[PDB]
Amino acid sequence: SNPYQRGPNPTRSALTADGPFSVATYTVSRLSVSGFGGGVIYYPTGTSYTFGGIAMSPGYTADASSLAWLGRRLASHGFVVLVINTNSRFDGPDSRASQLSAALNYLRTSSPSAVRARLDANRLAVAGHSMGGGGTLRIAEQNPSLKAAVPLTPWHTDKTFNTSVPVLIVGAEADTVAPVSQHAIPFYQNLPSTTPKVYVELCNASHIAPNSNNAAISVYTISWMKLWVDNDTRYRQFLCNVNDPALCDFRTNNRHC
Ligand SMILES: [Cl-]
C-alpha cells in the first residue's frame, strides 16, 4: 500500500538528522537559467526510486547557502530539492513566488538527466524563509496543483492567501523581522477553513532560526512534506496530538489527523 512510500518507519530522533538516502548535489549556474538566479539541487543517489520535488526560496538579502542544511536534510529523507538563488538578493516575496514557479518548471523540464531520473514531477511542493516564505504562500495560491507549502518565519504585506494547498507555517517567538503577530499568525488564520493547516511557534527563536540545523524545523518540515507529497501517513504521528516543549504555540484545524 502507498506507491510513494520511501524509507524506514520514522522516529522523532531520525527526523532531526540526515536521513537514509545518499545525497548528490548539482550547482545550477545563474546564467544557465531564465526566470531565477540558479541555485543548488540536492537529490537522492545510489537508488532506483523516484521522489517528489521541492523548490525552496531563501529570504531577503540571503543566498541559497542559508538553507543548504535544510535542502540536504530534506533530500536525504527522499526528495529532489532545488534551493534557488534569486535574480536579486533584494527581490520581494511576489518576485520570489515567480522565481519558485520558474524553478519548478526547470526541475521538471531542464534539469540534468540524473536529477530528472530521480524526480516524480507529478508531486511538487514549495518552502521558503522570510520573504521566500511569503513567496511560498503566494505561489501556493497561484498554483493549487502543489502538494504542500512550508513558509518558515514568513514575511508578506498581503495577509490572505486563498489556497487549497496544505500549509504548515513555522513562526519564531522572538522574531523582530517578521513578528508572528503581524505575519505568521495572520497568514495561518486567513488561510481557508477547509485547507489543512498547522502553525508551530518556536520558543525563544529569532528570524534566523531557519538558517542553521534546527530539530523542530527538521521534524515539522520533513513530516509535512512526507504526509502530503508522499501521502505517507506514518508521519501523522509527528503532527497530531502534539506536545512539544520546543513549541510556544501550536494551532491546527486537524484536517490532517
Ligand atoms: Cl538567471
Author numbering: 2 to 258
Excerpt from the paper describing this PDB structure:
Enzymatic degradation of PET using suitable hydrolases, like the leaf branch compost cutinase (LCC) variant ICCG, offers potential for PET recycling under relatively mild reaction conditions. Computer-aided enzyme engineering performed by Tournier et al. introduced an Ile at LCC position F243 to enhance the enzyme’s catalytic activity by further expanding the substrate-binding site. Additionally, thermostability was increased to 94 °C by disulfide bond formation between D238C and S283C in combination with mutation Y127G. In this study, ICCG was utilized for the application of a crystal contact engineering strategy to increase crystallizability and test the rationality of the applied approach.
Out of seven mutated surface positions (L32, L50, S111, S194, A206, S207, and I209) for introducing an aromatic π-π interaction (Tyr, Trp, Phe), IMAC-purified ICCG mutant L50Y (named ICCGY subsequently), successfully crystallized in µL batch experiments with the established HTP conditions tested (0.8 M succinic acid at pH 7.0; 1.0 M succinic acid, 1% (w/v) PEG 2000, 0.1 M HEPES at pH 7.0). In addition to the successful implementation of batch crystallization for ICCGY, the nucleation window for this mutant is broadened to varying concentrations of succinic acid and PEG 2000, as depicted in Figure 2. However, the purity and homogeneity of ICCGY variants after one-step purification via IMAC were sufficient for HTP screening and successful batch crystallization, eliminating the need for SEC as a second purification step. Molecular structure analysis revealed a change in the crystal system for ICCG (space group I222) and ICCGY (space group P41212). The change in the crystal system of ICCG(Y) from I222 to P41212 is associated with a denser-packed ICCGY crystal structure, resulting in smaller crystal channels. Also, the two space groups are formed by varying crystal contacts, resulting in different neighboring amino acids for L50 and L50Y. Although a π-π interaction between L50Y and Y107 was intended, the analysis of the crystal structure of mutant ICCGY indicated an interaction with neighboring R7 (cation-π interaction). As the shift in the space group (I222 to P41212) is linked with the formation of different crystal contacts, no π-π interaction between L50Y and Y107 was established at the ICCGY crystal contact, but presumably an intramolecular cation-π interaction (with R7). Nevertheless, ICCGY was used for crystal contact engineering studies to increase crystallizability, as this mutant crystallized reproducibly in batch crystallization experiments. Nevertheless, this study managed to not only generate singular LCC ICCG crystals for crystallographic purposes but also to implement a reliable experimental setup for reproducibly crystallizing ICCG mutant L50Y (ICCGY) variants, which is essential for applications in downstream processing.
